[PDB]
Design a protein around this ligand. Structure first.
Ligand SMILES: NC(=O)[C@H]1CCCN(C(=O)C2(c3ccoc3)CCC2)C1
Ligand SMILES: [Zn+2]
Length: 140
């Protein structure tokens, strides 16, 4: 579990969004596993605006932050799960690391701020849904 809190926005994994998130919806994209809902109070996370490919992520199943190298956001095939059929997930970045059911939502950060959140796992890999292209998160 986990979310990004920037301005009056809450960014979560679309497959983990609560009934309250859907009742206060701003934007969602199934192909990216992302959902953004509105908030009353202002958040303090800063979104990275960069092309960094090294950062640190939080892994809840190990209670540990890991430094990782990660690939550029791409269209990657993700196996069928209880949340989605087998499909290409877009804006996804992979790293060699630990990720198991329960780790989605963990923040990936670089020197510039928040890069994205854990969205995939298994096979000794971790996938992160990129949020650096969502420039609108910084305004309105
Ligand atoms: N974005 C998606 O389509 C994911 C939805 C949740 C499940 N997904 C995973 O990759 C798995 C996982 C491992 C660790 O966290 C999650 C489930 C076994 C691998 C796929
Ligand atoms: Zn960066």
């Amino acid at each position: 579990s986990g979310a990004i809190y920037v301005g009056n926005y809450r960014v979560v994994n679309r497959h983990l969004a609560t009934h309250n998130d859907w009742a206060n919806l701003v934007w969602e994209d199934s192909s990216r596993d992302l959902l953004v809902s509105s908030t009353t109070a202002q958040g303090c996370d800063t979104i990275a605006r960069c092309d960094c490919q090294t950062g640190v992520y939080y892994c809840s199943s190990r209670r540990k932050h890991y430094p990782v190298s990660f690939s550029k956001p791409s269209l990657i095939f993700v196996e069928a799960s209880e949340y989605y059929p087998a499909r290409y997930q877009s804006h996804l970045m992979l790293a060699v690391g630990h990720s198991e059911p329960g780790d989605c939502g963990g923040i990936l950060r670089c020197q510039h701020g928040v890069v994205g959140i854990v969205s995939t796992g298994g096979n000794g890999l971790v996938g992160f849904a990129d949020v650096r292209d969502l420039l609108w998160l910084d305004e309105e």
